[PDB]
């Protein structure tokens with residue numbers, strides 16, 4: 385049972401970066417290279433290409449495992465004699481750092497919204513055995529220029545896998561944001577919490593909680609752990625916000641709140657959607673019927689790699705709200721409550737609902753939509769499925785998807801090409817059988833652009 389995931393679509397290319405992209409401007413420079421706004425040479429579509437001077441399979445590999453509304457999207461990557469190129473989604477709102485140095489101080493509303501999303505991203509990461517290790521405003525972007533824009537985590541270049549059994553030793557991070565245990569040399573994922581706790585402090589007050597004349601002075605202050613709410617700007621701030629801050633900056637790792645639990649903090653919760661949009665999205669999800677693997681990959685590809693941010697803004701909000709526990713995966717129960725929530729919005733009566741019928745209704749949706757069979761509906765699976773099928777199955781998107789599947793340009797999708805798309809040596813004759821039997825028209829052993837077109841076009 386080959387698992388369709390967005391990540392499987394990012395392949396190590398065997399074209400030259402410059403054969404497919406063109407630089408526009410610099411968005412930012414990093415310690416070992418720069419991130420460069422590029423346009424795809426054929427479609428003028430804009431990406432942010434992170435360039436890494438060899439003079440890192442891992443930043444790519446971690447990113448293929450992540451699919452989350454507040455985590456940066458990786459599209460593909462290239463390798464050079466001298467360089468790696470990581471083709472990424474561009475987020476046009478720039479750094480949270482800039483917005484911090486600009487707006488100076490944040491609304492409790494705006495801070496909670498920002499922090500909720502960061503915490504959601506890392507709760508998800510932590511679930512997948514990944515620790516970020518370098519959270520700071522510089523590594524958080526706003527998606528676009530809108531007022532209350534969505535937040536994206538980036539710079540997975542210091543991130544790594546962790547095991548609950550062993551602990552990490554390497555000293556990684558940034559003075560203001562680094563957790564004391566990282567300095568000492570034995571740490572776990574809770575360092576990301578500490579960092580987020582620092583970030584939250586800054587957003588609400590404008591100042592770091594641990595400062596000094598220079599790096600060294602800061603690390604001493606950090607390593608002491610002592611911080612204060614003694615500044616005038618804190619008289620304005622509610623105790624619950626401070627309470628969360630205290631729990632996130634608890635000196636001792638074991639006493640410190642996890643991301644997962646931080647999401648449930650009173651403050652984050654206490655602090656919108658057109659019923660039509662919700663209705664359509666839930667309708668579009670209910671009407672998705674599972675299908676053979678060629679179509680599945682195609683749709684997930686179209687959903688996960690070929691939709692723009694502008695196209696998914698409604699869908700992005702809906703997901704985060706349907707994700708009651710924030711963890712970046714929709715489960716049976718959350719999905720159940722979405723329907724119910726919609727039912728309330730339509731005046732239906734709760735008691736007048738067959739909870740077990742809905743439960744069954746949702747068991748089947750999950751079966752249909754859970755492309756990778758991990759028992760959860762993740763963001764890209766959601767998007768693929770919830771987007772209006774005429775919009776999604778635009779003539780462009782269709783053409784572009786087939787193009788990507790048909791690797792050898794032959795104008796026909798072969799089982800070998802399908803295996804390649806999945807990231808597997810070949811496809812079960814059984815699963816390829818199950819495909820043609822539903823798609824092959826001429827009857828020639830392969831799927832061409834007309835055969836493909838009709839397969840999905842039956843919406």
Ligand SMILES: Nc1ncnc2c1ncn2[C@@H]1O[C@H](COP(=O)(O)OP(=O)(O)O)[C@@H](O)[C@H]1O
Pocket residue numbers: 411412413414415416417419432434472473474475476478479522523525538539540541
């Ligand atoms: N997708 C993106 N969209 C817009 N700006 C970006 C993007 N990715 C990175 N940047 C800018 O480039 C900077 C450096 O990128 P980052 O991945 O943090 O690399 P480094 O590890 O070298 O800091 C970011 O802080 C940000 O300003």
Ligand SMILES: [Ca+2]
Pocket residue numbers: 707708709710711712713714715718
């Ligand atoms: Ca969830």
Ligand SMILES: [Ca+2]
Pocket residue numbers: 754755756757758759760761762765
């Ligand atoms: Ca899934």
Ligand SMILES: [Ca+2]
Pocket residue numbers: 790791792793794795796797798801
């Ligand atoms: Ca082919």
Ligand SMILES: [Ca+2]
Pocket residue numbers: 824825826827828829830831832835
């Ligand atoms: Ca055929």
Ligand SMILES: [Mg+2]
Pocket residue numbers: 414522523539
């Ligand atoms: Mg950075």
